[model samples]
Target: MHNYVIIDAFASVPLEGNPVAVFFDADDLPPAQMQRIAREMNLSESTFVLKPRNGGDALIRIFTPVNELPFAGHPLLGTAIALGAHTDNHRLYLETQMGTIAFELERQNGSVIAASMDQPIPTWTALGRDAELLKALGISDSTFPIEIYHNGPRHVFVGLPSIDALSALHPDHRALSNFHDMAINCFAGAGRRWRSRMFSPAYGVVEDAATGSAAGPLAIHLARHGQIEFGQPVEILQGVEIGRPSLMFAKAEGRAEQLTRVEVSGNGVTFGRGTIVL
Candidate 1:
């Protein structure tokens, strides 16, 4: 048997964020079984914790309903918080398939209230403007440019003229999957406040309430395009259209190839726990 907890990440209130299943002691479980359990959990993402083989605090494997990911944002934050509760370490370095990710825990008195993760540097693949991309997203307006960004996971980042245009998207996964198999992020909002919606049918997530991984890359992408200034924190609001409102704080440091750090911070609330029978 194994113990698991479901945490609502990037939400201020209960049930208002992305839910992630974390298996805290999964050293004995095989990869096939972990994948099976991830599918059974049916969340956007699930995590298995094991002893680090790479000299980090823990080894974390992230899985979607359909496949495993090298690294994911919410799982790192949620898993770090859960692990922090059992130890006094405020900083945790977890080994992921991508690399070792550093996480900092924010505590109120002694309890963990939030977590912040240092993401890999942002990389891009320019998609420019394509008719098929527009058709897939049901976007007719040509005001915003389309680009794909990656920190750990990739998302198609589309800038919209308005939040209404972002919310109006009825994505055709068949069309999108034909070009790329990853998440799509549509965003709008002026100044430092941004609102976004993410869809990833290709990776088994139809939509995500708050996507921390995408948030990091989106910030860097906006900064590069001069839409938003770098070296400052921006707030991203997601999932309002789906009613599970979530907030993610994203910021990047340095510039160009010298860009040293990108971070995403948010609160995670524990809502449920259970034991999985092996």
Candidate 2:
């Protein structure tokens, strides 16, 4: 019923990073069919763009294979690239169910060189379910107390000892599903470099190559615990296990309790485009 473009967000080349299918001019697509289209595409998530409702540039709806998301990182980033790929606008205000997010685009010769989004301010709480989380992830323990943060999706941070430990996780899917509505992040690093692996069985994604939503929180979590300084840019590497090998950049400004700005930036390339007749 609509045309879609596949853009690999957080990637420099094809077949790397996280891929999201963006459907444009979809005012007539119903929520049920949108859900099915997302399933039909079968990526981590897909986006539908329709006429703006509140005077924004575009109104965007993000859906995973099984459910709709109030907010997500890659969908917005990829949407900006997909739309900005042909526009003169250097910035766009994409509205989501959570709120309108502003994206700054840097383009060169009709191609987006890089794009950044001003993410929503996050709020967090201490998570007390360490034992169950540990059991589900098949890890011995986390380096610090487990905590959950909300920037849209519920993200729980679990600190591992090293990159090796972070790469060696084998979480039990059934146990992970019990958490429901939360994405489990296992990470290890210091200074400005980090490694991450995300599991979200409940969200219908077993492992995500690069999670834009979780990257900012990871930086904030580290800075709050004195692992990194606030306003410092951190690089996270992931998707190695799944062979997509992705890179993500994130920075958080101000103290953890009073964040003034949070930005997640990346480069994406158009993989393909097609029309799904339904």
Candidate 3:
């Protein structure tokens, strides 16, 4: 028998945000079994927590229904929350394929109020207007130049003029799947507030409710495009179209390549637990 918890990251309340099933003491499971279990869970992503091989608090493996990711935002944050439930430590270092990720957790009466993670510095490439990409998103064009940022998941940003325009998207997943390795982030907002939607068929998610990996880069994107200054934080609302509204906060400390740092912050709700006999 093994234990697992269902935690909603980027959510303060139950039944909101992006949910991930995090299995504990998962060192015994093979990668294939983890993959199978992730598919069975049917969440956007599932995580397995193993003893740290790199001297961190834990080594986490992330899986989607169809594939594995070297790193991800929500899964790592949710997994950190899971770790907090078992330990007295509020600060932790989680090892992923990408590297060790640092987290600082705020707790109130044994519950995590918020968690802030220092995400990997990102690099980006501007994309020329591609008709196929436009057709897949059901949009004619974007307000800003399209670019793909690499933090873990390849995040492609498309700016829309208004929240209404962002909401009206009726994307074709079959068409989106053609991109194969990037999460499409469509957003609209100004200054400190924004609305976002994510799609990544390559990761086996048709649409993502909240994407931690994309959020940090978004702050950088806004800075790079002159919408917001460096170190300015942004609150992004996501997953509303799917009825699982999620809120995320992110910021970038420096410009383009000389990125001094990037951070993503949110809350996690551990609402359910289960034991699996395997």
The per-model lDDT (C-alpha) reads 0.84, 0.88, 0.89
Query: Candidate 3 clashing pairs?
Result: none
Q: Could you give candidate 1's per-residue lDDT for residues 1-278 as a string of tens digits? A: 99888888897578998888999889999999999999999888899999999889999999988888887887778888777777788788899998899889888877777989989887887776468778888877545557787766678887789888888888887777775566888899887999999887666667788888898887887787787878878899999999999999999888856787998999988878899888
Candidate 2, which segments miss by more than 4 Å at Cα? none
Q: Residues 1-278, candidate 3: write the lDDT tens digits.
A: 78999999999888999899999999899999999999999888899999998899889999988889898898888988888877778698999998899999889998776789999898889865467889999889889889999877789999999999999999988898889678899999988999999988877677888988999989999998999999888999999999888999999997776888899999999879999987
Q: How much is 8 displaced in model 1, in angstroms?
A: 0.8
Order the candidates by lDDT, highest first — what do you get?
A: 3, 2, 1
Clashing pairs in 2: none
* RMSD from true fold, candidate 3: 1.5
lDDT of 2 at 150: 89
lDDT of 2 by residue, 1-278 (tens): 68889999989898998899999888999999999999888888899998889878999999988899899998788989998866789888899998889999988887886799989888899888899999988887899779999888889999999888888888898898889778998899888888888989767678988888998888889888889899999998877888887788999999876899998998888999999886
CA lDDT, candidate 2, residue 36: 95
List TM-scores for all candidates, in order.
Answer: 0.94, 0.95, 0.95
Model 3 whole-model lDDT (C-alpha atoms): 0.89
